[PDB]
């Protein structure tokens, strides 16, 4: 496929460029540290906050349509399904609430720094902290939405066969939803010690 | 060195544009998927046509969230502004756009199924509406974060 | 750093061209899908062709949105201009352009399905028009954002 050809082309040119700079004695030109040390920390922080809710919403939306389409299909000959199985949608939607909540907390950190302190130790720490803290919450919520959704669709299909089965399968959705809390807890921990931009 | 470099407006301009672009793609997909569903089922059941357009108007709603954020962000653009104001309104653009995009896809997929099922199990309609609205808010949660960030965009900024 | 570097017009030219390019791809796809549907069904029912042609007209309008934004941007190009004007009218170009592409895909699919089905269920035609209007305004939202940005491109600018 054509996209794989692009990947190998990009890999090869990167290797050649690195080897070229190395042999000519300019290996220190490609200085990842100075890039990381000199870009504005407002980029990392705002990019983290955006992707946090953004990816969380993608997870919830993906979970809902996995569950909803099967629930509607199962309901055609068993309309009793529609009202009791709503809980599976609830477990998907709450994953978006956690994304919103973290956005509330992090937004308070976005004070504006004076120019003399822009790239100081404390401000840089907050910039990196918010970025990765946002990613873990967003990525964990994205994964969580899929797992709950796939289980929710499975529950609706099973419930239509015998009402006694739903209660037993529902247990698996609880285990799936816990991944939302753990993502939230780690997000708050790694961000909790950072200070607002001084 | 300086807080207000010449390229700072770039993030504002692309933030303003991406807010409507991604939201528009989401609403288009939501309209397309459900639209075929309506046309498919109404051939035999024309009487319930106007009951079944709900997924289309709900998809239409998402586009309006993109518009208002784009308008609210746009009024903040200026030639001289800090990187602080640049990135914070890029975050507003990304968050609403990426949220509305996801909400549009979900409304399309579940609305397609709901419209077909509703044609032969009439109790199933209320089930559809309940699920769709929980998809709609996924756009709204994007709007709220965009509003929060935008409320802060020019507060106390030195430049 | 200069407010008005020599490469500033570049983003203007890209914005000017991008406005009409993407909008034409949207209108082209909407015309193609609708055209196949019309030709496929009107063989048996030729009497209703001039009623079923509306989706082609609806897709055709989207190209006009791109044209006017492209022309309005074009007449603001100059050799010496602030970089801020370049980014703003790049954003004006993208917002209408890729909104037109999104609306084009929507009109193409529901236009085909609606025409295909309407030929054996006369009550469905009003439904097709009603859905197409929701698809149409997705382009209009892009135009409104583009014109707002464009109006802001040259006021209170120093160079």
């Amino acid at each position, epitope marked *: 496929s054509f996209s794989h050809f692009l990947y190998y082309l990009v890999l090869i040119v990167v290797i050649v460029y690195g080897l070229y700079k190395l042999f000519t004695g300019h290996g220190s030109d490609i200085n990842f540290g100075k890039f990381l040390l000199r870009t504005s920390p407002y980029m990392w922080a705002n990019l983290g906050i955006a992707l946090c809710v953004g990816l969380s919403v993608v997870g919830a939306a993906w979970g809902i349509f996995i569950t909803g389409s099967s629930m509607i299909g199962a309901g055609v000959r068993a309309p009793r399904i529609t009202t009791k199985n709503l809980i599976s949608i609830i477990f998907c939607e709450v994953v978006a609430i956690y994304g919103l909540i973290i956005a509330i907390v992090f937004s308070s950190k976005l004070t504006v720094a004076t120019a003399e302190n822009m790239y100081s130790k404390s401000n840089l720490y907050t910039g990196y902290s918010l970025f990765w803290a946002g990613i873990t919450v967003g990525a964990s919520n994205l994964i969580c939405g899929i797992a709950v959704g796939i289980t929710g669709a499975t529950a609706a299909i099973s419930d239509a066969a015998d009402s006694a089965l739903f209660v037993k399968i529902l247990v698996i959705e609880i285990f799936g939803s816990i991944l939302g809390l753990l993502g939230l807890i780690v997000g708050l921990l790694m961000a909790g010690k950072a200070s607002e931009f001084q | 060195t*300086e807080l207000c470099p010449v390229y700072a407006p770039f993030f504002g301009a692309i933030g303003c544009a991406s807010a409507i672009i991604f939201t528009s793609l989401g609403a288009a997909y939501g309209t397309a998927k459900s639209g075929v569903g309506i046309c498919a089922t109404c051939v035999l059941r024309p009487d319930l046509l106007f009951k079944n357009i709900v997924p289309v108007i709900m998809a239409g709603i998402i586009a309006i969230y993109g518009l208002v954020v784009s308008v609210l962000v746009c009024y903040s653009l200026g030639q001289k502004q800090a990187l602080y104001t640049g990135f914070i309104q890029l975050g507003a653009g990304l968050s609403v756009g990426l949220s509305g995009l996801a909400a549009g896809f979900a409304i399309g997929i579940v609305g397609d199924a709901g419209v077909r099922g509703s044609s032969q199990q009439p109790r199933l309609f209320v089930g559809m509406i309940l699920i769709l609205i929980f998809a709609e808010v996924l756009g709204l949660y994007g709007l709220i974060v965009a509003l929060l960030l935008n409320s802060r965009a020019t507060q*106390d900024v030195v*430049c | 750093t200069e407010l008005c570097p020599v490469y500033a017009p570049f983003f203007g030219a890209i914005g000017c061209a991008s406005a009409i390019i993407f909008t034409s791809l949207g209108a082209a796809y909407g015309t193609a899908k609708s055209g196949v549907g019309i030709c496929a069904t009107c063989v048996l029912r030729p009497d209703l062709l001039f009623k079923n042609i509306v989706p082609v007209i609806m897709a055709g309008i989207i190209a006009i949105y791109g044209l006017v934004v492209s022309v309005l941007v074009c007449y603001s190009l100059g050799q010496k201009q602030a970089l801020y004007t370049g980014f703003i009218q790049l954003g004006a170009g993208l917002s209408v352009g890729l909104s037109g592409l999104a609306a084009g895909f929507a009109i193409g699919i529901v236009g085909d399905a609606g025409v295909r089905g309407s030929s054996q269920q006369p009550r469905l035609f009003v439904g097709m028009i009603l859905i197409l209007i929701f698809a149409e305004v997705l382009g209009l939202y892009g135009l409104i954002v583009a014109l707002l940005l464009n109006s802001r491109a040259t006021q209170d600018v120093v160079c």
Partner: nanobody, 115 residues
Framework: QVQLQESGGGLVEIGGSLRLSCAASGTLFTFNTMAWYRQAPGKQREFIATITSGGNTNYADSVQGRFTISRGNAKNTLYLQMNSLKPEDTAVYYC???????????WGQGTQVTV
């Protein structure tokens, strides 16, 4: 468009105290630097005082300990106060507001004071 206005000018008794007030409008950001200048007839403009957004103050030697400059509660508002005045202080006085880089450097219309 940005604009500025002085106020508080006019004639005053010898040795009297006086205050000048200034404001700037039409921009969303706080100005990095704001300052006062003066001009007597037959002379070029003379520096008087300046204050940063962080509240740091600097003065001309001639008015050291006689004049005081401060910012107001709200953004982009400025004050000058002189505890006593003498004939060599008579002039028109101007506000100035500046940006850390670029051509964005604004000046007011000015107001007169005499003994």
């Amino acid at each position: 468009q940005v604009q500025l206005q002085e106020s508080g000018g006019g004639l005053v008794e010898i040795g009297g105290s006086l205050r000048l007030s200034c404001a700037a409008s039409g921009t969303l950001f706080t100005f990095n630097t704001m300052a006062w200048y003066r001009q007597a007839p037959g002379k070029q403009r003379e520096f008087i005082a300046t204050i940063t957004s962080g509240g740091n103050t600097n003065y001309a030697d001639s008015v050291q300990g006689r004049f005081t400059i401060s910012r107001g509660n709200a953004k982009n508002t400025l004050y000058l106060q002189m505890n006593s005045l003498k004939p060599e202080d008579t002039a028109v006085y101007y506000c100035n507001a500046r940006t850390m880089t670029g051509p964005f450097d604004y000046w007011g219309q000015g107001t007169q004071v005499t003994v």
